[PDB]
Amino acid sequence: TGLELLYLGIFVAFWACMIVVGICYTIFDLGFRFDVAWFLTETSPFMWSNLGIGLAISLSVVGAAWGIYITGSSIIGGGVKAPRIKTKNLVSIIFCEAVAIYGIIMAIVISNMAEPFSATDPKAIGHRNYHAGYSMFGAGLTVGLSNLFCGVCVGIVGSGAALADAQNPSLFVKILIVEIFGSAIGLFGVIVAILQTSRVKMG
Amino acid sequence: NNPEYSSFFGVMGASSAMVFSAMGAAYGTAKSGTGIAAMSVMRPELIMKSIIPVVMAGIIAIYGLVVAVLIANSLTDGITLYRSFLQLGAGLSVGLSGLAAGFAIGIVGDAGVRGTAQQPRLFVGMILILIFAEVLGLYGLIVALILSTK
Amino acid sequence: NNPEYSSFFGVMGASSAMVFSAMGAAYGTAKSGTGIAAMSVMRPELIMKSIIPVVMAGIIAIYGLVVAVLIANSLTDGITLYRSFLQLGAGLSVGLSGLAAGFAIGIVGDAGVRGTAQQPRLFVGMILILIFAEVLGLYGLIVALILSTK
Amino acid sequence: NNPEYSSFFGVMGASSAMVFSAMGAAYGTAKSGTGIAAMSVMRPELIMKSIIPVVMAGIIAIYGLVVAVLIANSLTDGITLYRSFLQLGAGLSVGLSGLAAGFAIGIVGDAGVRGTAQQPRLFVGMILILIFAEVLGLYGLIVALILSTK
Amino acid sequence: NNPEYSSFFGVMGASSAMVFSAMGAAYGTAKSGTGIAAMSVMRPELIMKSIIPVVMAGIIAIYGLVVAVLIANSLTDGITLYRSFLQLGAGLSVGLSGLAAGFAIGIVGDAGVRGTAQQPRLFVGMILILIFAEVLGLYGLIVALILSTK
Amino acid sequence: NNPEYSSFFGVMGASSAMVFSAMGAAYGTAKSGTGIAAMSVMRPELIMKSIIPVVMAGIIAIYGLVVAVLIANSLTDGITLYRSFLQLGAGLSVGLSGLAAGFAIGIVGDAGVRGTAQQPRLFVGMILILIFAEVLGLYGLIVALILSTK
Amino acid sequence: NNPEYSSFFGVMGASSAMVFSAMGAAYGTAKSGTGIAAMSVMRPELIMKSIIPVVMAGIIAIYGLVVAVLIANSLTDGITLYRSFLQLGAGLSVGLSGLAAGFAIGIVGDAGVRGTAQQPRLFVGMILILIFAEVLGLYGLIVALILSTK
Amino acid sequence: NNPEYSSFFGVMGASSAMVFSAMGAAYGTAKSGTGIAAMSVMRPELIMKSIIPVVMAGIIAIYGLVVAVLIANSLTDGITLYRSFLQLGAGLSVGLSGLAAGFAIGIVGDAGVRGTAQQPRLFVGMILILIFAEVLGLYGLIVALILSTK
Amino acid sequence: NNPEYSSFFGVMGASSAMVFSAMGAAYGTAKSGTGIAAMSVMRPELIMKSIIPVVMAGIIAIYGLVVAVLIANSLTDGITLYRSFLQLGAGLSVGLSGLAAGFAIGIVGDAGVRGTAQQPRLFVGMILILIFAEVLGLYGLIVALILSTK
Amino acid sequence: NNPEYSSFFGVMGASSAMVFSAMGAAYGTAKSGTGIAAMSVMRPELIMKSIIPVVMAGIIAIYGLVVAVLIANSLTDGITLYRSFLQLGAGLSVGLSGLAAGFAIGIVGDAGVRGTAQQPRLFVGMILILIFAEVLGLYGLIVALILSTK
Amino acid sequence: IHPPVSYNDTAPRILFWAQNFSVAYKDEWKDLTSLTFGVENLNLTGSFWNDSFAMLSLTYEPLFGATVTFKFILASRFYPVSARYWFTMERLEIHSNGSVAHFNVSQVTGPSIYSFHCEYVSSLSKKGSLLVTNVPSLWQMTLHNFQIQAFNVTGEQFSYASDCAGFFSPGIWMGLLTTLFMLFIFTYGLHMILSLKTMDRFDD
Amino acid sequence: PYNLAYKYNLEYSVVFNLVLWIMTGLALAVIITSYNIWNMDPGYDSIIYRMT
């Protein structure tokens, strides 16, 4: 378990550093130095917005592809002895890809929210503008991960569906209900992202 | 007026609600779904009965969505830092709660579907266990509603 | 002259109280549920006598909800730093106590219900051990309410 | 006068005392319970007497609780950082010492019951080792009480 | 006027656009070629038909290249922080998308090539599935272009 | 004069002295207990005579307690930062020395008691290795004492 | 005007352009070489014709060399941060692209050679897959060169 | 000058000097004892002479003690930062060196005693190897001594 | 005048230069040695021919030494940060590249030697692959030399 | 004047010079000794010659001692930061180089003695390989001496 | 080490120090350290103090064909985010022959009960440019090892000092976020690529 | 005198981050290389079962 032990080690080291540094700053009275406000304010809103969009598309694509191959491996393997599978169980693939479709829709929608500032001072940038940054970042994060999880879910259930179909033709049309419910989660993510961006304006 | 950076935590509250709820619902759905798929070939007469756990996972997802919508509507560019923290609290409360609930629904659904495949009488007990598992997310939803509305 | 950032800790107390107790309850339901599903294939008559651990995990969850809701009610927009830290302490106390107690409840229920399946005399030992576990969540609740109300 | 964040470490102590000792007690409870449920199959007559390990483990939780509530009633809004540090020390002492104790009780009891299933004489040695395990939690209580009182 | 470090984010965007796409392509080709060899030893006559998945991996690599060079074209000295982050967004968008698409194309390709080796009827299925993965890379590329040309 | 947080390192020294010694003693008792339980099956006449390793683990705990108590007794409020550091040093010394000793006693005993069960001759050897492992905790105590006095 | 520490990112461009392409070539030659050794014991007359994958890994290395040498030539003292970042970007683009490419080369070469030993006709297909991976390193070079000259 | 935090490094030096040497001795004793227990069942007559590697671990412990006592003797409130740093250096020098020596002695003994049980002649060669393994700690001690008295 | 801390990066270049080169060489020698030992038990006639990969690793060692000597000689107490950074770049470029070459040399040496015992014809190809492995370290040395002299 | 904390890096240089060389020598000693035991059991007569690798590991220990002592004798309070960083570089350069050399010597010693038991004539190649491994530590020393005396 | 400049009101109330203090007009530099610190003839006329506000008016008679003066204008106030009174140096006001010039100040801030320190508080780009203007100006100023405290003073001593020297800067933080979200992706990719494997056997 | 603050440099942020992250990368590289060699397979499989 080499690389996982590495990730665990770096994680433990990072959070040990966080804990100790927190205790030391509090004990030394450096709450004025440690003010999260400065971090959140001087990190430019553009960075938030654009990480937001990039994740919005990319995490959605990750979910789509992950689920895609999870179910495709099964679809192929079962199809080996069950050629009927290839046309029918492809609905698993299509429902996986719908996640990346959502990814684009929200990514481009958010991209329509961005505009320059011509301001550097936080006071000049303003509440509206900083809110635009954080809101775009959050909406992107939300859509991206909801899509990711919907995708992995749909892929897994679709793999199960293809394997089940391999043994009986009739079951697939019924198991697909679980696939529909899986897609519903991604749709919820899309809705939440829409609401989050609905009242956002850079400029 | 309230500080410029305040709205960040409210944004995160909405996002956390939806995202962690989605994680929970996705796991529950996928686990119950693999269980259902494996069971179907054996005892095809039980599919439409065995679905229910996926509906419970969807219920967790709905729990997430409700809170997320509430925070989204409550959110504005000039919220007080206090209300922003409270929105984040509501979001995390429903979200992580839904995640735990989702792991519960997934594992219980898988095991119970597998059992009922072998022994029908387990069904009602499985429903009861599923209810108690979703009840976990329900508690998170209650606390989140209170935090948000306060 | 109450810092606005101070109120965050009370929100986090409420969150923790909900979420960690929720995770404990989820694991407790999960392991007991897999145990129950395994047992039910061979000894179905034990379903209702064996669901008790799930109920006890539910009690862990209700403990979490009680503490979280109380913390939420106590919260205010200008809450003092002292009281807010008290609420964080209550939240962590109850939440992690519930996490641990739920871990115990789940493992005990799994192993036990399986034990009863082969040996029904064990049922009394199960219920004793399960309550001894739930008592840990009780202690978490005690401490949590004391801090949250001071 | 005194720094306002002083109370944070006091509440941290109050929490730690209960939470860590509770984790130890939970682990001990779990391991001993699995051992009990295992041994019951072959020698069902021994379960009640053999529960003594879970009975002993709950004591670590009692210890955690007492130190927790003592830190609690010692807390107030204006404590000096010195006192807050003593409270943190007491909490960590009892909690983590109880965690070590709980690992000890869990392992020793789990092994001991299974052994006793094959050799009833072991019971006495099991009790002896279990006492030597609880005393670790007890020492943590001693140091925690001294610190918190100072 | 503009901060002196502004170009770093655009550069990172370009580098990511190249690199993540390249890694995805590499994984895809490696997996696919492995499957191609495995099928080959038994079925020499399918090499030319079977190579396709490696070709789609090449497509994702090309997607990375086009996006990367497009960003490089926009990497100007007086780049405003706004444009720089737009280019970083383009970078990540194409890059992670391509990495995922490479995973998908590679795994699907291996599975499909092995299946075809035994069942010629599956080849059309292979291609049909693979296109649905490659369109993901198309999607990432599209959004990256929109961002870079905002 | 002294910065008001100087006692932090003193309380940390106390916590270390107790807790790490407790961890070492717990590990020692745990592994010794596994050894005793395992050997009990075929050699029950060795139980009462084989408890020695657990006793030595108890002595580990005793050093922990002694150093922690000395530390706490000597903690005055305006403690010079110098002695506070020295005191963290004493606590760490005894505590981690006790942890090392705990590893030593536990690993020694878990194998030594089994070896004795097969071979009575080993008992003297095992006690010799145990005392040599015990002097490790003893050295930790010496060093901690000199730093506490100093 | 030219922050003093600017030289760092150009230097890292150089270092990466070398080291990451080198690691890629190293893995490629390594895995391919294990494959060559394995095949040798069966099919000696293929040995000389089989080395192409190691050659292409060496081409990954030469790509690294071209980019790194150009970067070093461009490393002037008073470099602007703009050019230093472009210089780093070129470095990473070549280096990591080559790392991925070399991974691909290694796996594919191993698979291809051992297959070829079993079935000669695989040779052309293997060459094609190697080419389609190598173009990845070529793109790494192209993007790195563009970034560096711009 | 002499900042008030100076003595911390020297104190940590003493702690390390004892603690790391103690851990090394602990592991050495543990492995050597496990090997001794394994050997005794077969050849009980070797115990008196075979114990020696544990004594070598004890020598490492003694090295740790000597450096620790020297450091402690040297400490002082008005210690100059340079003396504190030398003290820390000596502490690490002895401690980690002893840890390495402990690893070496432990592994060597575990292997060598087992081998000797199966072959009488190995004894002396084993002793030579242990001598070299301890020589490492002796170098550690010398370096720590020079640093401390510098 | 230049910032005093610049010296750090030059010394780091020296250290990295020698260290990574040495580690790569060590890996190469070690695995090649395992191969040689496994080979010899069969074919002692191939010892002198089989030693070659170890020499090839020693070549990496020599490369590291060369760059490190250059870095150390060039260091000065008033080194500009530009030159210090440049020295760091040279060190990384040779050292890590040599580490990659070290893994390559070692793995190929092991596999090739083992095969060669089974099939002497492999030897020529094993030389060619060894050379291709080393030219990686040669490229590292070239880049590092250019950097160190600029 | 140079800041007071400057001598940190010199003291670390000495300590590391001892410590990492120690770790490398310890590992080499360890593996060599395991191999020596294994070979000796079957072929006791070969011990006296087979010990040599442990001696060559002791050589790494010697390198570490030499460089550490040199640095210690060079340390001074008014040490220039540049000289201090030079000493740190030397310490790392000897130490981690010795780590690499100890790794190589350990693996080679293990494998080579294990083979030598079966084929004595491997001794020549073994000795040559250990020479090639020790020259790594020699290079580390040469770099360290240059850096430190500079 | 020369003593700080102090304005007193029944006790020292505003305190200022630097190792080097210099100014230029039409790019002709001149040094003010000796004429500023320790010397009693430093006219502070017009200087003013309030618990909310402070204005330190240093003065030099012959400089640049003018009786020049430098007003450092500082204030303190309650920020609801935290209970503390923060302080800031709002602007620097040069007073010259029949003329005035205004420099905004960027990063001189901190808790009012702590002093503030910075290397090279100066208008020149190469040295941080903490003093800034929209209008291009004839004036340059440089303060090497600038340190100041205008509130909660207690005797000649400075309070403990906050410093410009944060462990991070805006640019560095944004860069670290960017590189971290690149590294996440890279580690994912490298993990999967390293989990790649090859088969040991082939069919008939 | 006069409680003058310690003279933190202006480029403290950049120098500190460079040191921290370069040393982190160096330490991780060293640790991983050591890990890989520590687990290097000694590869005497032809001998292991005769020895054991």
Write out I2-44 in H/E/C secondary structure.
CCCCHHHHHHHHHHHHHHHHHHHHHHHHHHHHHHHHHHHCCCH
DSSP K91: E
User: Are B33 and A182 an interchain contact pair (Cβ–Cβ within 8 Å)?
Assistant: yes
Query: How would you classify the pairing of strands K85-96 and K109-111?
Result: antiparallel
CA gyration radius, chain H: 18
Sign of CA dihedral A196, A200, B3, B8: positive
Sign of CA dihedral F99, F100, F103, F106: negative
CA distances in angstroms from H117 to C60, G81, H93, listed in the order given: 57, 69, 36
Q: How far is G18 from chain L (nearest CA, A)?
A: 16
Residue A80 CA to its chain's centroid (Å): 34
Q: Does F81 touch chain A (CB under 8 A)?
A: no
Residue J105 CA to its chain's centroid (Å): 9
CA distances in angstroms from J96 to A134, F128, J21, J63, listed in the order given: 46, 37, 7, 11
Residues forming a β-bridge with K139: K25
Q: Which of A160, A171, A181 is the closest to B44 by Cβ?
A: A171
- In three-state secondary structure terms, K76 is strand
Residues forming a β-bridge with K132: K104
* Contact predicate G93/E14, CB 8 Å: yes
| Distance (Å, whole) CA E43 – CA E45 | 5
Residues forming a β-bridge with K87: K76, K110
| Distance (Å, whole) CA J104 – CA J94 | 15
| Distance (Å, whole) CA D137 – CA D18 | 12
Q: Does I37 touch chain J (CB under 8 A)?
A: yes
Residues forming a β-bridge with L17: none
How many structural domains compose chain F?
Answer: 1
* Contact predicate F39/F117, CB 8 Å: yes
Burial of F48 (0-12, 13-18, 19+ CB in 10 A): exposed
| Distance (Å, whole) CA K68 – CA I102 | 69
CA atoms within a 13 Å half-sphere pointing along the CA-CB vector of K119:
12
User: Are H132 and J54 an interchain contact pair (Cβ–Cβ within 8 Å)?
Assistant: yes
DSSP K163: E
- In three-state secondary structure terms, K172 is helix
* Contact predicate L17/I3, CB 8 Å: no
Rounded (5°) CA angle G72-G73-G77 = 80
**Residue G6 one-letter amino acid:** S
- In three-state secondary structure terms, I76 is coil
Burial of H133 (0-12, 13-18, 19+ CB in 10 A): buried
Neighbour subunits, F (≥3 Cβ pairs < 8 A) = A, D, H
Q: Identify the H or E element spanning D135.
A: helix D122-149
Q: Which of C14, C29, C36 is the closest to B93 by Cβ?
A: C14
Write out K101-149 in H/E/C secondary structure.
EEEEECCCEEECCCEEEECCEECCHHHCCCEECCCCCCEEEEEECEEEE
Q: Does I122 touch chain J (CB under 8 A)?
A: no
| Distance (Å, whole) CA J45 – CA I75 | 53
- In three-state secondary structure terms, K75 is strand
Instruction: List CB contacts of A127: < 8 A, sequence separation 6 or more.
Output: B1, B2, B4, B6, B7, B77, B78
The side-by-side arrangement of strands in the sheet containing K121-122 is: K28-31, K20-25, K139-144, K121-122
| Distance (Å, whole) CA E63 – CA J109 | 52
| Distance (Å, whole) CA D20 – CA D94 | 8
* Contact predicate E58/E105, CB 8 Å: no
Sign of CA dihedral A181, A183, A186, A192: negative
Alpha helices in chain H, H assignment, sequence order: 7-42, 47-50, 52-74, 81-118, 122-149
Of A65, A79, A68, the residue nearest A158 (C-alpha): A68
DSSP H107: H
Sign of CA dihedral K173, K179, K185, K191: negative
Nearest-by-CA chain D residue for F55: D132
| Distance (Å, whole) CA H101 – CA J24 | 10
CA atoms within a 13 Å half-sphere pointing along the CA-CB vector of L32:
19
User: Are F93 and H18 an interchain contact pair (Cβ–Cβ within 8 Å)?
Assistant: yes
* Contact predicate C81/C26, CB 8 Å: no
- DSSP state letters, D31-94: HHHHHHHHHTTT-GGGHHHHTHHHHHHHHHHHHHHHHHHHHHHH--TT--HHHHHHHHHHHHHH
- In three-state secondary structure terms, J14 is helix
| Distance (Å, whole) CA D4 – CA C132 | 39
Of F2, F3, F9, F51, the residue nearest F29 (C-alpha): F51
User: Are H104 and J30 an interchain contact pair (Cβ–Cβ within 8 Å)?
Assistant: yes
Task: Check contact A-H (3+ Cβ pairs < 8 Å).
Answer: no
Of I51, D45, F84, C4, the residue nearest J127 (C-alpha): I51
User: Are A47 and K177 an interchain contact pair (Cβ–Cβ within 8 Å)?
Assistant: yes
| Distance (Å, whole) CA E40 – CA G102 | 23
Q: Does J118 touch chain H (CB under 8 A)?
A: no
* Contact predicate J136/I22, CB 8 Å: yes
| Distance (Å, whole) CA A201 – CA A126 | 11
Pick among F9, F19, F71 to test the D interface (most D CBs inside 10 A): F19
* Contact predicate A44/K174, CB 8 Å: yes
| Distance (Å, whole) CA B9 – CA B5 | 9
Task: Check contact J-D (3+ Cβ pairs < 8 Å).
Answer: no
| Distance (Å, whole) CA G38 – CA G86 | 44
Q: How far is D110 from chain A (nearest CA, A)?
A: 29
Burial of J55 (0-12, 13-18, 19+ CB in 10 A): middle
Residue B6 CA to its chain's centroid (Å): 27
**Residue B113 one-letter amino acid:** V
Rounded (5°) CA angle L10-L16-L18 = 115
| Distance (Å, whole) CA E15 – CA G29 | 25
* Contact predicate J142/I65, CB 8 Å: yes
Chain breaks in chain H (C to N over 2.5 A) after: none
* Contact predicate A65/E99, CB 8 Å: no
- In three-state secondary structure terms, E75 is coil
User: Are F37 and D132 an interchain contact pair (Cβ–Cβ within 8 Å)?
Assistant: no
| Distance (Å, whole) CA C71 – CA K89 | 42
Q: Region of D83 please: left (phi>0), alpha (psi -120 to 50) or beta.
A: alpha
Of I88, I143, I113, the residue nearest I36 (C-alpha): I113
Residue K172 CA to its chain's centroid (Å): 19
Around Cβ H18, how many Cβ atoms within 10 Å? 38
- In three-state secondary structure terms, E147 is helix
| Distance (Å, whole) CA J79 – CA J7 | 6
Of I141, I125, I5, the residue nearest I64 (C-alpha): I141
* Contact predicate I73/I90, CB 8 Å: no
Q: Tokens 């089940």 appear where?
A: A164
- In three-state secondary structure terms, C67 is helix
**Residue H52 one-letter amino acid:** I
Of G3, A185, H29, the residue nearest B54 (C-alpha): A185
* Tokens read off for L27: 């330490």
| Distance (Å, whole) CA H100 – CA J18 | 11
Q: Which of A142, A161, A178 is the closest to B29 by Cβ?
A: A178
Chain breaks in chain J (C to N over 2.5 A) after: none
| Distance (Å, whole) CA D134 – CA D54 | 12
**Residue I103 one-letter amino acid:** F
Q: The domain containing residue F91 runs over which residues?
A: 1-150
- In three-state secondary structure terms, H65 is helix
Residue F137 CA to its chain's centroid (Å): 5
| Distance (Å, whole) CA D16 – CA D9 | 10
Q: Does I80 touch chain J (CB under 8 A)?
A: no
| Distance (Å, whole) CA J116 – CA J48 | 13
Q: Tokens 């990473």 appear where?
A: G92
Pick among A33, A61, A130 to test the K interface (most K CBs inside 10 A): A33
Q: How far is E1 from chain G (nearest CA, A)?
A: 13
Q: Does J66 touch chain H (CB under 8 A)?
A: no
Elucidation technique: cryo-EM
Neighbour subunits, K (≥3 Cβ pairs < 8 A) = A, C, E, G, L
**Residue K161 one-letter amino acid:** A
Instruction: List CB contacts of I104: < 8 A, sequence separation 6 or more.
Output: G25, G26, G27, G29, G30, G33, I133, I136
* Tokens read off for E99: 């990495």
| Distance (Å, whole) CA H123 – CA H61 | 23
Residue G133 CA to its chain's centroid (Å): 10
User: Are L15 and G5 an interchain contact pair (Cβ–Cβ within 8 Å)?
Assistant: yes
Nearest-by-CA chain J residue for L36: J103
| Distance (Å, whole) CA L19 – CA E57 | 39
Give the end-to-end CA distance of chain F in Å, rounded to a whole number. 20
Helices E52-74 and E81-118: crossing angle in degrees, nearest 10, is 170
**Residue C98 one-letter amino acid:** G
Q: Which of I92, I124, I136 is the closest to G15 by Cβ?
A: I92
Q: Does C40 touch chain B (CB under 8 A)?
A: yes
* Tokens read off for L36: 């890989």
Sign of CA dihedral J93, J99, J103, J105: positive
Sign of CA dihedral E79, E84, E86, E90: positive
Residues of chain J contacting I23 with CB distance shorter than 8 Å: 96, 99-100, 103
- In three-state secondary structure terms, C20 is helix
User: Are K147 and L12 an interchain contact pair (Cβ–Cβ within 8 Å)?
Assistant: no
Alpha helices in chain K, H assignment, sequence order: 33-36, 170-194
CA gyration radius, chain E: 18
User: Are B47 and A135 an interchain contact pair (Cβ–Cβ within 8 Å)?
Assistant: no
- In three-state secondary structure terms, F70 is helix
- In three-state secondary structure terms, K83 is coil
Instruction: List CB contacts of B93: < 8 A, sequence separation 6 or more.
Output: B140, B143, B144, B147, C14, C15, C18, C19, C68
User: Are A46 and E121 an interchain contact pair (Cβ–Cβ within 8 Å)?
Assistant: no
Q: Tokens 């989820």 appear where?
A: C26
- DSSP state letters, chain A: -HHHHHHHHHHHHHHHHHHHHHHHHHHHTGGGTT-HHHHHHHS-HHHHHHHHHHHHHHHHHHHHHHHHHHHHHHHHHHHHH-TTHHHHTTHHHHHHHHHHHHHHHHHHHHHTT-------SHHHHHHHHHHHHHHHHHHHHHHHHHHHHHHHHHHHHHHHHHHHHHH-GGGHHHHHHHHHHHHHHHHHHHHHHHHHHTT----
CA atoms within a 13 Å half-sphere pointing along the CA-CB vector of G67:
44
Sign of CA dihedral E93, E98, E103, E107: positive
CA distances in angstroms from F46 to D104, F118, K100, listed in the order given: 21, 11, 98
Q: Does I131 touch chain G (CB under 8 A)?
A: no
* Tokens read off for L17: 């981050």
Q: How far is K158 from chain E (nearest CA, A)?
A: 34
Q: How far is A182 from chain K (nearest CA, A)?
A: 25
Residues of chain L contacting K142 with CB distance shorter than 8 Å: none
User: Are A145 and B23 an interchain contact pair (Cβ–Cβ within 8 Å)?
Assistant: yes
